[PDB]
């Protein structure tokens, strides 16, 4: 939440390794450059911050969620245990004016959109005719034996980035009208892989 840290990163520890760390570092720097333009910053080394909490790796079993909230010159690390969660149903929510192109710690709108999920497990934000993100992650849609993700999401997820880099998913423009074409919907994010 906190007032003076307006951005964050959520990192998974799984099987005693921090995951997709360089993807997080990239977004972190991209974010510093967009949010603090004209400033000359020294970015933190996110891998080093994590690594030095050696207690995070004592055990191979278990999942840990590490959140790093930051601003232009400081950060806070917080670690919680995590249990796998299942997201299977998604409520379409219509919202044409929402910017979540960085991972802002102020998530008031996203949280208000999520309240519209009713009986679904989560939401699916339709912005300007296009399927974008759910409230906590990006979305993937099954077609044939492939997984397709929207080429214009609200936020470029780290998990999405790794999956694209590995060719495990495919980027494509997805209009709301296109949902017809797909067989299954799922979420992806730092805590929810494929």
C-alpha atoms as a printed R data frame, in Angstrom:
    type eleno elety resid chain resno       x       y       z
1   ATOM     1    CA   UNK     A     1   0.000   0.000   0.000
2   ATOM     2    CA   UNK     A     2   2.479   2.416   1.423
3   ATOM     3    CA   UNK     A     3   2.421   6.054   0.533
4   ATOM     4    CA   UNK     A     4   6.002   6.705  -0.347
5   ATOM     5    CA   UNK     A     5   6.599   3.611  -2.452
6   ATOM     6    CA   UNK     A     6   4.446   3.856  -5.545
7   ATOM     7    CA   UNK     A     7   5.725   0.851  -7.454
8   ATOM     8    CA   UNK     A     8   6.492  -2.826  -6.638
9   ATOM     9    CA   UNK     A     9   7.708  -6.221  -7.848
10  ATOM    10    CA   UNK     A    10   6.442  -9.621  -6.671
11  ATOM    11    CA   UNK     A    11   9.010 -12.371  -6.806
12  ATOM    12    CA   UNK     A    12   8.456 -16.080  -6.407
13  ATOM    13    CA   UNK     A    13  10.798 -18.348  -4.515
14  ATOM    14    CA   UNK     A    14  10.095 -21.893  -5.670
15  ATOM    15    CA   UNK     A    15  12.022 -25.028  -4.902
16  ATOM    16    CA   UNK     A    16  14.575 -22.789  -3.163
17  ATOM    17    CA   UNK     A    17  15.233 -20.571  -6.156
18  ATOM    18    CA   UNK     A    18  14.140 -17.010  -6.856
19  ATOM    19    CA   UNK     A    19  12.374 -17.133 -10.220
20  ATOM    20    CA   UNK     A    20  12.682 -14.995 -13.365
21  ATOM    21    CA   UNK     A    21  14.883 -12.594 -11.495
22  ATOM    22    CA   UNK     A    22  16.389 -10.913 -14.537
23  ATOM    23    CA   UNK     A    23  12.894 -10.249 -15.864
24  ATOM    24    CA   UNK     A    24  12.076  -8.499 -12.694
25  ATOM    25    CA   UNK     A    25  15.273  -6.476 -12.807
26  ATOM    26    CA   UNK     A    26  14.458  -5.360 -16.386
27  ATOM    27    CA   UNK     A    27  10.962  -4.146 -15.589
28  ATOM    28    CA   UNK     A    28  12.237  -2.532 -12.464
29  ATOM    29    CA   UNK     A    29  14.730  -0.436 -14.447
30  ATOM    30    CA   UNK     A    30  12.240   0.271 -17.293
31  ATOM    31    CA   UNK     A    31   9.911   1.469 -14.565
32  ATOM    32    CA   UNK     A    32  12.454   3.689 -12.894
33  ATOM    33    CA   UNK     A    33  13.142   5.266 -16.306
34  ATOM    34    CA   UNK     A    34   9.477   5.908 -17.116
35  ATOM    35    CA   UNK     A    35   8.320   7.043 -13.632
36  ATOM    36    CA   UNK     A    36  11.421   9.132 -12.782
37  ATOM    37    CA   UNK     A    37  12.467  10.506 -16.120
38  ATOM    38    CA   UNK     A    38  15.236  13.169 -16.197
39  ATOM    39    CA   UNK     A    39  16.595  11.657 -12.940
40  ATOM    40    CA   UNK     A    40  19.936   9.872 -12.718
41  ATOM    41    CA   UNK     A    41  19.293   6.853 -10.494
42  ATOM    42    CA   UNK     A    42  21.338   3.943  -9.108
43  ATOM    43    CA   UNK     A    43  19.097   1.003  -9.324
44  ATOM    44    CA   UNK     A    44  19.087  -1.702  -6.661
45  ATOM    45    CA   UNK     A    45  20.268  -5.157  -7.634
46  ATOM    46    CA   UNK     A    46  17.122  -7.158  -6.944
47  ATOM    47    CA   UNK     A    47  18.955 -10.504  -7.185
48  ATOM    48    CA   UNK     A    48  21.393  -9.382  -4.475
49  ATOM    49    CA   UNK     A    49  18.597  -8.184  -2.171
50  ATOM    50    CA   UNK     A    50  16.925 -11.561  -2.290
51  ATOM    51    CA   UNK     A    51  20.020 -13.750  -2.233
52  ATOM    52    CA   UNK     A    52  21.210 -12.140   0.988
53  ATOM    53    CA   UNK     A    53  18.029 -13.305   2.769
54  ATOM    54    CA   UNK     A    54  19.580 -16.711   2.888
55  ATOM    55    CA   UNK     A    55  16.729 -18.060   5.136
56  ATOM    56    CA   UNK     A    56  14.515 -17.898   2.044
57  ATOM    57    CA   UNK     A    57  16.389 -20.881   0.622
58  ATOM    58    CA   UNK     A    58  16.809 -23.184   3.546
59  ATOM    59    CA   UNK     A    59  13.978 -25.342   2.204
60  ATOM    60    CA   UNK     A    60  13.270 -26.781  -1.289
61  ATOM    61    CA   UNK     A    61   9.527 -27.567  -0.463
62  ATOM    62    CA   UNK     A    62   7.292 -24.515  -0.106
63  ATOM    63    CA   UNK     A    63   6.518 -21.398  -2.065
64  ATOM    64    CA   UNK     A    64   7.389 -17.895  -0.894
65  ATOM    65    CA   UNK     A    65   6.119 -14.578  -2.140
66  ATOM    66    CA   UNK     A    66   8.607 -11.730  -1.951
67  ATOM    67    CA   UNK     A    67   7.372  -8.262  -2.540
68  ATOM    68    CA   UNK     A    68   9.715  -5.377  -3.086
69  ATOM    69    CA   UNK     A    69   8.057  -1.986  -2.931
70  ATOM    70    CA   UNK     A    70  10.338   0.827  -4.142
71  ATOM    71    CA   UNK     A    71  10.783   4.452  -5.029
72  ATOM    72    CA   UNK     A    72  13.697   6.336  -6.589
73  ATOM    73    CA   UNK     A    73  16.064   5.694  -3.702
74  ATOM    74    CA   UNK     A    74  14.837   3.035  -1.240
75  ATOM    75    CA   UNK     A    75  12.922  -0.215  -1.075
76  ATOM    76    CA   UNK     A    76  11.129  -2.472   1.369
77  ATOM    77    CA   UNK     A    77  11.226  -6.255   1.146
78  ATOM    78    CA   UNK     A    78   8.443  -8.297   2.608
79  ATOM    79    CA   UNK     A    79   8.102 -12.065   2.492
80  ATOM    80    CA   UNK     A    80   5.046 -14.207   2.976
81  ATOM    81    CA   UNK     A    81   4.330 -17.865   2.656
82  ATOM    82    CA   UNK     A    82   2.217 -18.710  -0.388
83  ATOM    83    CA   UNK     A    83  -0.191 -21.530  -1.221
84  ATOM    84    CA   UNK     A    84  -1.002 -22.392  -4.832
85  ATOM    85    CA   UNK     A    85  -4.346 -21.011  -5.949
86  ATOM    86    CA   UNK     A    86  -6.746 -22.066  -8.682
87  ATOM    87    CA   UNK     A    87  -8.283 -19.518 -11.016
88  ATOM    88    CA   UNK     A    88 -10.774 -20.998 -13.490
89  ATOM    89    CA   UNK     A    89 -13.642 -18.560 -14.150
90  ATOM    90    CA   UNK     A    90 -13.341 -14.933 -15.205
91  ATOM    91    CA   UNK     A    91 -15.892 -12.112 -15.195
92  ATOM    92    CA   UNK     A    92 -15.665  -9.694 -18.083
93  ATOM    93    CA   UNK     A    93 -15.444  -6.154 -16.698
94  ATOM    94    CA   UNK     A    94 -15.694  -3.141 -19.016
95  ATOM    95    CA   UNK     A    95 -13.322  -0.328 -18.364
96  ATOM    96    CA   UNK     A    96 -12.044   1.983 -21.105
97  ATOM    97    CA   UNK     A    97  -9.994   4.325 -18.964
98  ATOM    98    CA   UNK     A    98  -7.412   2.566 -16.900
99  ATOM    99    CA   UNK     A    99  -3.612   2.888 -17.030
100 ATOM   100    CA   UNK     A   100  -1.742   0.152 -15.295
101 ATOM   101    CA   UNK     A   101   1.287   0.127 -17.620
102 ATOM   102    CA   UNK     A   102   3.622  -0.027 -14.633
103 ATOM   103    CA   UNK     A   103   3.085  -2.044 -11.560
104 ATOM   104    CA   UNK     A   104   1.662   0.731  -9.330
105 ATOM   105    CA   UNK     A   105   1.249   0.096  -5.655
106 ATOM   106    CA   UNK     A   106  -1.930   2.153  -5.767
107 ATOM   107    CA   UNK     A   107  -4.362  -0.464  -6.991
108 ATOM   108    CA   UNK     A   108  -7.602   1.175  -5.952
109 ATOM   109    CA   UNK     A   109  -9.212   0.914  -9.431
110 ATOM   110    CA   UNK     A   110  -8.112  -2.644 -10.011
111 ATOM   111    CA   UNK     A   111  -9.497  -3.564  -6.620
112 ATOM   112    CA   UNK     A   112 -12.808  -1.869  -7.355
113 ATOM   113    CA   UNK     A   113 -13.038  -3.696 -10.689
114 ATOM   114    CA   UNK     A   114 -12.364  -7.008  -8.919
115 ATOM   115    CA   UNK     A   115 -15.403  -6.381  -6.695
116 ATOM   116    CA   UNK     A   116 -17.457  -6.959  -9.813
117 ATOM   117    CA   UNK     A   117 -16.376 -10.619 -10.125
118 ATOM   118    CA   UNK     A   118 -19.530 -11.940  -8.440
119 ATOM   119    CA   UNK     A   119 -19.308 -15.752  -8.444
120 ATOM   120    CA   UNK     A   120 -16.228 -15.862 -10.691
121 ATOM   121    CA   UNK     A   121 -12.720 -16.479  -9.466
122 ATOM   122    CA   UNK     A   122 -11.423 -13.272 -10.955
123 ATOM   123    CA   UNK     A   123 -12.058 -10.691 -13.693
124 ATOM   124    CA   UNK     A   124 -11.141  -9.999 -17.256
125 ATOM   125    CA   UNK     A   125 -10.676  -6.345 -18.155
126 ATOM   126    CA   UNK     A   126 -12.083  -5.290 -21.487
127 ATOM   127    CA   UNK     A   127 -10.550  -1.979 -22.466
128 ATOM   128    CA   UNK     A   128 -11.412  -0.261 -25.715
129 ATOM   129    CA   UNK     A   129 -12.760  -3.500 -27.194
130 ATOM   130    CA   UNK     A   130  -9.744  -5.566 -26.260
131 ATOM   131    CA   UNK     A   131  -9.132  -8.306 -23.723
132 ATOM   132    CA   UNK     A   132  -6.297  -7.132 -21.473
133 ATOM   133    CA   UNK     A   133  -5.526  -8.359 -17.979
134 ATOM   134    CA   UNK     A   134  -7.188  -9.817 -14.881
135 ATOM   135    CA   UNK     A   135  -6.783  -7.773 -11.643
136 ATOM   136    CA   UNK     A   136  -3.632  -9.598 -10.500
137 ATOM   137    CA   UNK     A   137  -2.060 -10.933 -13.712
138 ATOM   138    CA   UNK     A   138  -2.083 -11.379 -17.423
139 ATOM   139    CA   UNK     A   139  -4.364 -13.809 -19.297
140 ATOM   140    CA   UNK     A   140  -3.842 -16.774 -21.623
141 ATOM   141    CA   UNK     A   141  -6.383 -18.494 -23.816
142 ATOM   142    CA   UNK     A   142  -6.246 -21.982 -25.212
143 ATOM   143    CA   UNK     A   143  -6.673 -22.604 -28.900
144 ATOM   144    CA   UNK     A   144  -5.882 -25.909 -30.428
145 ATOM   145    CA   UNK     A   145  -2.919 -26.901 -28.407
146 ATOM   146    CA   UNK     A   146  -1.503 -23.437 -28.050
147 ATOM   147    CA   UNK     A   147  -1.802 -20.688 -25.522
148 ATOM   148    CA   UNK     A   148  -2.426 -17.187 -26.850
149 ATOM   149    CA   UNK     A   149  -2.014 -14.008 -24.809
150 ATOM   150    CA   UNK     A   150  -3.129 -10.434 -25.723
151 ATOM   151    CA   UNK     A   151  -0.471  -8.447 -27.557
152 ATOM   152    CA   UNK     A   152  -1.726  -5.282 -25.673
153 ATOM   153    CA   UNK     A   153  -2.046  -6.068 -22.003
154 ATOM   154    CA   UNK     A   154  -2.439  -3.415 -19.313
155 ATOM   155    CA   UNK     A   155   0.874  -4.518 -17.767
156 ATOM   156    CA   UNK     A   156   3.692  -6.436 -19.393
157 ATOM   157    CA   UNK     A   157   4.079  -9.210 -16.848
158 ATOM   158    CA   UNK     A   158   7.364 -10.792 -15.970
159 ATOM   159    CA   UNK     A   159   5.795 -14.253 -16.230
160 ATOM   160    CA   UNK     A   160   4.254 -13.357 -19.557
161 ATOM   161    CA   UNK     A   161   7.664 -12.055 -20.736
162 ATOM   162    CA   UNK     A   162   9.439 -15.348 -19.840
163 ATOM   163    CA   UNK     A   163   6.761 -17.459 -21.389
164 ATOM   164    CA   UNK     A   164   6.915 -15.425 -24.604
165 ATOM   165    CA   UNK     A   165  10.686 -15.635 -24.599
166 ATOM   166    CA   UNK     A   166  10.443 -19.403 -24.241
167 ATOM   167    CA   UNK     A   167   7.726 -19.569 -26.939
168 ATOM   168    CA   UNK     A   168   5.437 -21.348 -24.450
169 ATOM   169    CA   UNK     A   169   2.737 -18.766 -25.266
170 ATOM   170    CA   UNK     A   170   2.001 -16.603 -28.343
171 ATOM   171    CA   UNK     A   171   1.064 -12.918 -28.514
172 ATOM   172    CA   UNK     A   172  -1.964 -11.822 -30.503
173 ATOM   173    CA   UNK     A   173  -4.535  -9.099 -30.689
174 ATOM   174    CA   UNK     A   174  -7.685 -10.355 -28.914
175 ATOM   175    CA   UNK     A   175 -10.935  -8.482 -29.235
176 ATOM   176    CA   UNK     A   176 -13.707  -9.226 -26.849
177 ATOM   177    CA   UNK     A   177 -15.624 -10.674 -29.753
178 ATOM   178    CA   UNK     A   178 -12.806 -13.160 -30.122
179 ATOM   179    CA   UNK     A   179 -13.451 -14.957 -26.833
180 ATOM   180    CA   UNK     A   180 -15.738 -17.155 -28.904
181 ATOM   181    CA   UNK     A   181 -12.654 -18.603 -30.606
182 ATOM   182    CA   UNK     A   182 -11.025 -19.912 -27.401
183 ATOM   183    CA   UNK     A   183 -11.481 -23.082 -25.307
184 ATOM   184    CA   UNK     A   184 -10.191 -22.165 -21.887
185 ATOM   185    CA   UNK     A   185  -8.934 -19.160 -19.917
186 ATOM   186    CA   UNK     A   186  -6.201 -18.958 -17.311
187 ATOM   187    CA   UNK     A   187  -4.156 -16.493 -15.409
188 ATOM   188    CA   UNK     A   188  -0.407 -16.050 -15.383
189 ATOM   189    CA   UNK     A   189   1.765 -13.949 -13.100
190 ATOM   190    CA   UNK     A   190   4.922 -14.144 -10.965
191 ATOM   191    CA   UNK     A   191   3.086 -16.568  -8.599
192 ATOM   192    CA   UNK     A   192   1.199 -18.502 -11.288
193 ATOM   193    CA   UNK     A   193   3.168 -20.177 -13.989
194 ATOM   194    CA   UNK     A   194   2.030 -22.295 -16.827
